Design an enzyme around this catalytic site. Structure first.
Site, short mmCIF file in Angstrom:
data_model
loop_
_atom_site.label_atom_id
_atom_site.label_comp_id
_atom_site.label_asym_id
_atom_site.label_seq_id
_atom_site.Cartn_x
_atom_site.Cartn_y
_atom_site.Cartn_z
N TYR A 11 0.80 -1.24 0.00
CA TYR A 11 0.00 0.00 0.00
C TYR A 11 0.84 1.30 0.00
O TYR A 11 2.06 1.28 0.21
CB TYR A 11 -1.03 0.01 1.16
CG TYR A 11 -0.48 0.24 2.57
CD1 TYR A 11 -0.20 1.54 3.05
CD2 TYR A 11 -0.27 -0.84 3.46
CE1 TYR A 11 0.29 1.75 4.34
CE2 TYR A 11 0.21 -0.63 4.76
CZ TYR A 11 0.50 0.66 5.20
OH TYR A 11 0.98 0.87 6.48
N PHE A 42 1.64 10.46 2.37
CA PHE A 42 2.19 10.40 3.76
C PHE A 42 2.85 9.06 4.20
O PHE A 42 3.62 9.06 5.17
CB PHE A 42 1.13 10.84 4.82
CG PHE A 42 -0.08 9.91 4.94
CD1 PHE A 42 -0.06 8.80 5.80
CD2 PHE A 42 -1.25 10.18 4.23
CE1 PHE A 42 -1.17 7.95 5.91
CE2 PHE A 42 -2.37 9.34 4.33
CZ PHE A 42 -2.33 8.23 5.17
#
Length: 107
Positions: A26, A36
């Site tokens: 991911y 982020f």
């Protein structure tokens, strides 16, 4: 709530179940403009159980509705995400989340 967009389709049948160890690469991005976090970046697959709540609620529910081998975009709303306070120091106030999820293998 959670709003799935298919990127590339999977098997279209075997969804995650109760007690299963989901294995996923991911990369997490904020509401428009900038990333982020990434599991690929760090050179290790990520492992999380469905139902036992080892992760945030939107990550646990979007993954469960996705298929094995599927790549998909999870545009989760702030109420099912970090939200108004957010995660202290890490995730800022009032943030719709965008996940680049890839379901490698259910175990």
């Amino acid at each position: 709530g959670v709003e799935i967009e298919t990127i590339s389709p999977g098997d279209g049948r075997t969804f995650p179940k109760k007690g299963q160890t989901c294995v996923v690469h991911y990369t997490g991005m904020l509401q428009n403009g900038k990333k982020f976090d990434s599991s690929r970046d760090r050179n290790k697959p990520f492992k999380f159980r469905i139902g036992k709540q080892e992760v945030i609620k939107g990550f646990e529910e979007g993954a469960a509705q996705m298929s094995l081998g599927q790549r998909a975009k999870l545009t989760c709303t702030p109420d099912v995400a970090y939200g108004a306070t957010g995660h202290p120091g890490v995730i800022p106030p009032n943030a719709t989340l965008i996940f680049d999820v890839e379901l490698l293998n259910l175990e």
